[PDB]
Amino acid sequence: MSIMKVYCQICRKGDNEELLLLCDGCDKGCHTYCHRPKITTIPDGDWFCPACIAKAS
Numbered sequence: 001m002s003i004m005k006v007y008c009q010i011c012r013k014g015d016n017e018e019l020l021l022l023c024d025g026c027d028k029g030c031h032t033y034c035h036r037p038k039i040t041t042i043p044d045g046d047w048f049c050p051a052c053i054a055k056a057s
């Protein structure tokens with residue numbers, strides 16, 4: 001067995017799933033409202049977290 005429950009890297013809670021961005025690079029989560037700067041566009045498709053982009057850049 002293996003269990004994955006997603007938690008937001010910042011506040012460390014899995015609530016508000018609708019505002020919880022799962023990064024498709026590294027599978028990590030972050031609430032839009034926990035982000036600095038805050039996200040006000042709930043992404044239309046795929047999310048790459050800030051850390052992943054600076055690697056991919």
Ligand SMILES: NCC(=O)Nc1ccc(N)cc1
Binds near residue numbers: 043044047
């Ligand atoms: N991995 C992309 C992602 O997380 N997209 C997403 C889309 C809609 C909502 N409400 C939340 C998250």
Ligand SMILES: [Zn+2]
Binds near residue numbers: 009013031034
């Ligand atoms: Zn959070």
Ligand SMILES: [Zn+2]
Binds near residue numbers: 028052
């Ligand atoms: Zn990532």
